[PDB]
Structure 1
Amino acid sequence: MSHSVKIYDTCIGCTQCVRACPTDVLEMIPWGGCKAKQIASAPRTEDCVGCKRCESACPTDFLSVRVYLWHETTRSMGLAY
């Protein structure tokens, strides 16, 4: 929020797990101890659309994200044109 859909999990390891999703997710930001030690839920999200391709793969064990952002640009929906 402005893009706020929680995909977080607990491993945040990203090998044979999850990568897919247009730009949005430049992570691998190792928090001082979480197994394959790369963590959190996002980077700077003011860039791309609203997928849930976000999970589909690699756990969120709870919810998984979708549209919830409301405040919604245009570069945030393909169509500002």
Structure 2
Amino acid sequence: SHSVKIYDTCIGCTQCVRACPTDVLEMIPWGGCKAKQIASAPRTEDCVGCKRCESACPTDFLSVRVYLWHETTRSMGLAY
């Protein structure tokens, strides 16, 4: 299972959650930004590691990060 971490520079634009192809991410309420929103990653046992979320984040530097880690059946994307 890969690791996905959210950092407090997040502006809560939700662009990363819209992009995930396996539904790893989620929005949760917060108080540190104008959107009162922050991303979370509750379901990292399904993450294929495509970094489609990182291409979508606009902050500099990134607010979502994907660290590739130990591989499994779901992580490798095997249908057999």
Q: CA RMSD in A?
A: 3.1
More strand by share: 2
TM-score norm. by structure 1 comes to: 0.65
* Deviation, structure 1 residue 28: 1.2
1:4–1:26 distance in 2 versus 1, CA, 3 Å: closer
Aligned length: 80
1:7–1:42 distance in 2 versus 1, CA, 3 Å: same
TM-score norm. by structure 2 comes to: 0.65
2:35 and 2:61 map into 1 onto residues whose CA distance is 21
Structure 1 unpaired stretches of 5+: none
1:4 and 1:39 map into 2 onto residues whose CA distance is 17
Deviations 1:6-35 (A, max 9, x none): 454623423567611112334110123321
Structure 2 unpaired stretches of 5+: none
1:60 and 1:19 map into 2 onto residues whose CA distance is 16
1:3 and 1:21 map into 2 onto residues whose CA distance is 14
After superposing the two structures, state which structure 1 stretch, 3-12 or 42-51, moved more. 3-12
More helix by share: 2
2:64 and 2:17 map into 1 onto residues whose CA distance is 14
CA contact (8 A) 1:49 1:76 kept: yes
